């Protein structure tokens, strides 16, 4: 320690700079050469300029076995603290791959947990950049325990403050479960994630796969259903993170602050021409979405997974809303195992954070297929019914076209708590297709007709007109009104405004039993 | 596992774990099938559970699969290790090849160095005594006393009252 | 160590190892402990808890510190034995420092084991008992050891008023370590134990004063002078008996009332109560004789028996129900309340309220002790503690005025305006704002200008200071025959056993310091 306070202050500055240098210039250059920002550049780019207030820059591991007693591990490989994003206080962590491969030391995990506990205590969002080789091997069960504390912390925060994970490098092994326990994962194209690597896999099963094939961003998005956004690079991941956060409240006791409201709810007659009267013809439901949300702006979640169903954040009159819509242009809009998970997770998340849910319905049923049954469509489809039945935020449903049997119920009708349900003139709410229905209740009557063809068509038409028109759905009270498609935005906006004061509660329970 | 754990928790039924797990099953389809989000359900269910949680480690207890079987960090109220318990971040051999890679390649007798380091790692971390040393287990027990240890733990925690942060519900993995 | 080759061999190795751990610091150090008239850490837990009920946690737990020799030091259980057991079938959690292990110095891991045990006690709603025998925070561990104490104190406060915490000092307790016992509810010290914030070595070096550990912080010093402890024990055996006796009056946690114990449902008259209190205000007596004749079987555990003896606080039972008794002791300092007695009563009253123990006071107080040092010592703020404690208390409060009850000292003994649910006056009850002499000397100052005072004093005394006037104003519910005391108290306690009093929402009030 220098002799004067001024000398000690200069000494402090020098010591701090060494820590901020992390793994040294060569490793930093290697990181950059791989197209990756460093741990500190990431926080610096994510957070409002100069708002980062760091905790534990000088924190050190206490482990001593296998070289650790002499190892110099800056900030133990993770930079943690608080800052702001567009003025909103947040807590964040950023793993430093240049320090022991970003391996998760016991103290590093402790720093992370402490940061998470602060976010919970103060009720602010928590964002984490992952770039690591997994638990620090030199520390054995000590680093293992660190992961145990982190996972438990992710669950503690679940549904209390939003948690966002950005995978910007490797994420090898069980470390991957932390991102899984957060609410949203944004993965860059330079990242790789998996529970078991390519090598161990080959040595155990003989299967040959590259890291990119096994756990690159595209694999996780389209195949595994593990992530929510694919980012080109760190700059894009940082932009996506801020855009995502803009739709969320700071915590579960608040509704998200309104942003750039468009209070116009004028009709738009073009909406009448997006959905074809010919039921065998499709369209992109996002064309409908674009016409009804503020400025046509929306942030699609899991855009590249189970594209037969669309989940996206958007706004109506400045208010954040979560939209769930069937995509008739993909698999005829059928719901399936994967779309069921995608929808349920989004519904459950919006509910925990007071975000209204808007449904756009055009579904003919669940996807037929032996593997859908063998894959457990019964238990997966049930997740949609469970998520909507449990949700208490305002639920607004617009039936665009087909709304068949259970799949219609899975899209939240009044029986599952929709607060307002509107039917377009093309709405076709049915227990099942008129053709299949007739073929069951009028089999013999059609048989003994000597001309079942003209008989079939008659009974089929009779069934269709008796139940499947929007007027019958309206006659039964299943929809509030049959509306002009051009008025969709105003109808939704009006319903959101009236239910903005909705106060609904559920029976006392630790929790329901969410399907697995 | 997760469904059973959530159910027991909902209806106040204590959870007893018997552990002997070497890790998650290797395989492309396991990754492609979303083992990350499915495995997370066990960590979620146990971490959210507030009923008494008692865990007995019989043998293998490796990495994330061990945590998934409810260790102290996920709220286990009592944890016991049999003398055969092998709680470890990973197998001594697998570890050695990663952190001693250099020292082995440069040793006069590489094979002897590897066996030496593997032995070192095994004894430094992977024995019931180190787990107990670190407090990851309440005690190392004679397998013969398992029923008694579980019974007494259940009895003392019959009055467990544990609270959770206020929330409509968490975000259970799908 | 390296594991054996078979399961049978490993079970044997396990028994061997556990045997080593349990030997603590070794035979010599164990013999030394014994030669000093002290039991070991494990012996104390074995004598306190029911036979074979001790379920130990952390026997194989080890410190992780490596500086200054710790890397090579073998320290069994890091110096503390922790776990759960039962006392009279009641689940409890306990800790016991092993002085034979590095002088019982509080290692970081040791304090961590203690905190974990305390958290379990809180989590399961059970009492926590701790045997202290230590040289204080382990010096070789520096700030790591310091942090452990911080965690311990925070925990003592977390459990405070939720589950009973009993500390037993059975040897040294050097330094701030002592703040843990202060934060528990009751401290029991043996005659072999010592406790102090600053030790004789430092005190001598800094102040030039050379005193012994025993003169500075021995049990008698803490009991009679400091006012830091609640029970003095001859040795470990008696401390353990005291711990059990103490616990028998307490519930498992703050959500329950203590379980009734060996109830005496008889409440017939006892004329022996009429004679204990002399009609001559100049003659004193031991108020405990009154207590003895009111409580079941005359049994009572007196708290702080050797401190501020001008006031008595003791647990007892009425019809098997635990109650706290607060009584003025006329045979000491005329029964005056003072700085030290205010503290003694307040702490007791507050503790009883936190654990749903009804409070019974026997009143015979002439006022607060006159004296410059009393004013200078803050009698105003220390005395306020009694008024605060009783005013805040929501448990049933039953008061019996035996003889004198003057001004503020009477309010401090909880009258109806302080929320007493039932107040009874004996026929010798003398409730007054102030003595009739000094009162006369004020309101008749002029009209007396001699011997005129005689008539005025008399007149004042009769206009206000009689049991019937107090009753006339409703300050006491009835004037009673001292032989019926036990019955009136019993009936009162029975009726108010279902009392549910509301209090304004607040984190906490401002308890005088
Ligand atoms: C619990 C659990 C579990 O999964 O269940 C655990 O976490 S067992 C976890 C086991 N974790 C792992 O097996 C994975 C580790 N190794 C890797 O796959 C790879 O390292 C990788 C994909 C992260 C990195 O590839 P890369 O080529 O970019 O790089 P490098 O090999 O240079 O590595 C970065 C440097 O960090 C070190 N390094 C990487 N991971 C670890 C770790 N977990 N513990 C200690 N050191 C580590 C490397 O040894 C190397 O050291 P130096 O400069 O000295 O050469
Ligand atoms: C925070 C804080 C504070 O209070 O503010 C701290 O706690 S500073 C705390 C500083 N702590 C202390 O100053 C107190 C110091 N030590 C003592 O006063 C005394 O030891 C005593 C009254 C407890 C016991 O006296 P004794 O003669 O019976 O015995 P001994 O000398 O044999 O000692 C028992 C053995 O335990 C060791 N020993 C005792 N206390 C400590 C301690 N705090 N840290 C580390 N080792 C300790 C002694 O070095 C000794 O070692 P061996 O067999 O090898 O000789
Ligand atoms: C096998 C493995 C584990 O450990 C991994 O990281 O691939
Ligand atoms: C060192 C010391 C102080 O504190 C003591 O115990 O005297």
């Amino acid at each position: 320690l220098a002799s004067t306070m001024e000398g000690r202050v200069e000494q402090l500055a020098e010591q701090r700079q060494v820590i901020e240098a992390g793994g040294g210039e060569r490793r930093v250059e290697k990181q950059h050469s791989q197209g990756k920002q460093t741990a500190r550049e990431r926080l610096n780019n994510l957070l409002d300029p100069h708002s980062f207030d760091e905790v534990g820059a000088f924190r050190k591991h206490r482990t001593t076995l296998f070289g650790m007693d002499k190892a110099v591990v800056p900030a133990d490989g993770v930079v943690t603290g608080r800052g702001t994003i567009l003025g909103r206080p947040v807590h964040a962590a950023s793993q430093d791959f240049t320090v022991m491969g970003g391996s998760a030391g016991e103290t590093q995990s402790t720093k992370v947990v402490e940061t998470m506990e602060q976010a919970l205590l103060t009720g602010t969002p928590f964002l984490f950049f992952y770039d690591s080789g997994g638990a620090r091997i030199q520390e054995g069960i000590d680093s293992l325990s660190g992961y145990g504390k982190m996972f438990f912390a992710n669950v503690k925060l679940s549904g209390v403050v939003p948690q966002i994970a950005i995978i910007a490098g490797p994420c090898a092994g069980g470390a991957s479960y932390s991102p899984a326990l957060t609410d949203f994962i944004i993965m860059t194209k330079k990242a790789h994630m998996f529970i078991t690597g390519p090598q161990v896999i080959k040595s155990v099963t003989g299967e040959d796969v590259t890291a990119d094939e096994l756990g690159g961003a595209e694999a996780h998005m389209a195949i595994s259903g593990n992530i929510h956004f694919v980012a080109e690079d760190d700059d894009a991941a940082e932009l996506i993170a801020k855009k995502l956060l803009s739709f969320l409240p700071q915590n579960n006791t608040e509704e998200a602050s309104f942003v750039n409201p468009n209070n116009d709810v004028s009709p738009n007659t073009e909406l009448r021409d997006i959905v074809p009267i010919d039921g065998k013809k499709g369209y992109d439901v996002r064309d409908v979405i674009a016409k009804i949300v503020d400025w046509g702006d929306y942030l699609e979640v899991k855009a590249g997974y189970a594209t037969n169903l669309v989940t996206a954040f958007a706004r109506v009159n400045g208010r954040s809303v979560g939209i769930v819509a069937n995509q008739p242009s993909v698999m005829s809009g059928c719901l399936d195992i994967n779309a069921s998970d995608k929808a349920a997770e989004f519904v459950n998340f919006c509910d925990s954070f007071n975000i209204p849910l808007v449904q756009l319905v055009d579904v003919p049923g669940f996807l037929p297929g032996v593997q859908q049954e063998y894959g457990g469509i019964i238990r997966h489809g049930a997740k949609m019914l469970y998520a909507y039945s449990e949700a208490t935020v305002p639920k607004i449903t617009v039936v665009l076209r087909k709304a068949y049997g259970g799949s219609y119920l899975a899209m939240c009708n009044r029986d599952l708590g929709a607060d307002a349900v509107y039917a377009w003139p093309s709405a076709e709410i049915a227990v099942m297709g008129a053709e299949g229905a007739a073929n069951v209740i009028f089999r013999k009557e059609i048989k003994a007709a000597d001309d079942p063809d003209a008989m079939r068509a008659e009974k089929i038409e009779e069934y269709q007109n008796a139940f499947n028109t929007p007027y019958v759905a309206a006659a039964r009270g299943q929809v509030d009104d049959v509306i002009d498609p051009a008025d969709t935005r105003r109808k939704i906006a009006s319903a959101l405004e009236m239910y903005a004061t909705k106060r609904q509660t559920r029976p006392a329970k630790k929790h329901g039993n969410f399907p697995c």
Side-chain angles (χ1 to χ4, degrees), chain A:
Chain A
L1 298 178
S3 49
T4 65
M5 188 63 83
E6 282 71 14
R8 294 195 185 196
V9 163
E10 297 172 359
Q11 174 177 61
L12 173 59
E14 309 181 318
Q15 301 299 74
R16 193 188 303 287
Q17 280 198 182
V18 171
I19 290 182
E20 284 180 38
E25 181 58 61
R26 187 181 68 61
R27 293 179 184 293
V28 161
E29 274 167 34
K30 186 172 192 175
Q31 178 84 331
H32 286 148
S33 82
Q34 303 181 323
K36 298 160 58 187
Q37 291 168 14
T38 66
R40 293 172 177 283
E41 288 171 349
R42 284 165 177 169
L43 289 173
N44 192 66
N45 292 330
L46 173 69
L47 306 172
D48 294 331
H50 203 70
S51 70
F52 186 50
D53 183 3
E54 184 178 10
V55 177
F58 289 97
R59 185 82 174 263
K60 298 179 183 179
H61 63 285
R62 294 182 52 180
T63 47
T64 58
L65 298 170
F66 306 122
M68 296 308 295
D69 56 353
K70 293 180 178 178
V72 175
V73 193
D76 211 37
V78 71
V79 186
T80 56
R82 46 180 175 279
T84 59
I85 291 177
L86 270 75
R88 305 166 51 175
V90 301
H91 285 78
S94 189
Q95 279 185 314
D96 192 354
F97 189 73
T98 67
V99 178
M100 295 193 66
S103 63
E106 171 199 32
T107 291
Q108 167 185 136
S109 285
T110 290
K111 288 182 65 178
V112 172
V113 173
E114 287 162 355
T115 298
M116 294 170 75
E117 292 284 6
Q118 299 323 296
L120 177 67
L121 182 69
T122 59
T124 70
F126 174 64
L127 302 94
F128 192 169
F129 288 91
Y130 295 81
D131 198 347
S132 158
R136 194 173 290 160
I137 299 169
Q138 290 83 170
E139 308 188 338
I141 66 175
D142 297 322
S143 61
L144 172 66
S145 177
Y147 272 176
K149 294 183 177 54
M150 186 186 49
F151 301 153
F152 183 91
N154 282 127
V155 177
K156 189 180 183 181
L157 271 64
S158 196
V160 188
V161 295
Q163 302 178 82
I164 298 172
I166 304 167
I167 316 302
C171 187
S176 305
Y177 289 125
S178 178
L181 292 166
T182 65
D183 299 309
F184 299 93
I185 302 174
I186 299 167
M187 194 165 175
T188 71
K189 285 181 173 165
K190 284 63 171 175
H192 292 94
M193 181 169 65
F194 41 65
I195 289 305
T196 304
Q199 44 287 158
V200 167
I201 285 184
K202 178 172 178 49
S203 72
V204 172
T205 75
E207 282 167 329
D208 284 83
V209 67
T210 64
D212 207 67
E213 287 167 338
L214 181 73
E218 217 53 63
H220 281 298
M221 170 64 74
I223 305 176
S224 309
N226 289 148
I227 64 164
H228 308 72
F229 302 91
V230 176
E232 184 71 26
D233 55 31
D234 293 349
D235 282 335
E238 289 148 6
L239 288 177
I240 291 169
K242 297 177 61 168
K243 178 64 175 181
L244 167 65
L245 194 62
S246 75
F247 296 93
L248 320 180
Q250 286 294 86
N251 60 63
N252 70 7
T253 70
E254 297 159 21
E255 184 169 6
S257 302
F258 283 16
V259 173
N260 191 207
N262 180 319
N263 298 316
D264 178 87
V265 293
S266 305
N268 188 320
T269 60
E270 271 176 41
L271 269 165
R272 299 174 185 164
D273 312 308
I274 296 174
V275 175
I277 292 297
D278 185 339
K280 294 181 177 176
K281 296 197 298 182
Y283 59 98
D284 189 327
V285 71
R286 286 167 297 190
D287 285 338
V288 180
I289 293 176
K291 300 295 194 184
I292 69 191
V293 300
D294 285 13
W295 326 108
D297 181 72
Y298 62 93
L299 174 62
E300 186 163 6
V301 180
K302 284 188 175 177
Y305 181 64
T307 62
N308 42 315
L309 179 121
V310 174
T311 52
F313 285 118
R315 298 192 173 83
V316 174
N317 300 150
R319 185 198 305 280
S320 297
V321 295
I323 296 177
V324 183
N326 307 112
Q327 183 63 293
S329 56
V330 174
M331 283 172 267
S332 297
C334 288
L335 281 172
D336 66 336
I337 286 169
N338 292 356
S340 287
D341 283 333
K342 178 178 177 179
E345 181 188 48
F346 186 72
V347 166
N348 285 329
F349 172 87
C350 286
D351 184 56
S352 301
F353 289 101
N354 314 306
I355 299 176
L357 290 160
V358 176
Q359 290 60 235
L360 300 181
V361 191
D362 195 346
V363 60
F366 290 87
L367 179 61
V370 171
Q371 296 303 147
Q372 282 294 305
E373 193 64 50
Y374 284 3
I377 178 67
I378 287 170
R379 61 198 172 84
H380 289 81
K383 302 178 189 182
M384 286 181 73
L385 298 165
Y386 182 108
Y388 277 119
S389 289
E390 175 183 60
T392 56
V393 292
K395 290 174 273 171
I396 304 302
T397 297
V398 180
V399 177
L400 301 183
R401 206 158 60 160
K402 296 180 192 64
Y404 286 30
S407 67
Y408 161 57
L409 299 180
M411 290 300 286
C412 199
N413 79 325
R414 202 188 306 290
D415 298 306
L416 272 75
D419 297 292
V421 177
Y422 304 104
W424 269 24
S426 42
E428 208 181 323
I429 297 167
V431 75
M432 75 194 283
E435 181 175 5
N439 269 297
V440 183
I441 60 182
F442 300 125
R443 52 175 180 290
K444 47 205 63 177
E445 354 290 314
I446 287 180
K447 160 217 59 184
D450 289 298
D451 183 40
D453 290 359
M455 176 59 121
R456 180 183 305 304
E458 197 267 49
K459 287 301 186 177
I460 287 185
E461 172 116 298
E462 206 180 313
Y463 194 81
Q464 175 81 315
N465 306 310
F467 289 122
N468 309 352
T469 85
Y471 296 99
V472 178
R476 294 299 198 283
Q478 294 193 26
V479 296
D480 294 20
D481 192 17
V482 176
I483 70 167
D484 174 354
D487 297 317
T488 303
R489 180 174 161 81
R490 173 170 65 81
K491 289 299 176 184
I492 294 178
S494 176
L496 286 168
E497 172 55 31
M498 174 65 259
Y499 287 95
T501 53
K502 173 184 177 179
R503 294 288 107 81
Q504 179 167 269
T505 64
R506 305 282 294 150
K509 61 182 80 184
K510 289 194 177 180
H511 52 73
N513 296 326
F514 188 72
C516 289

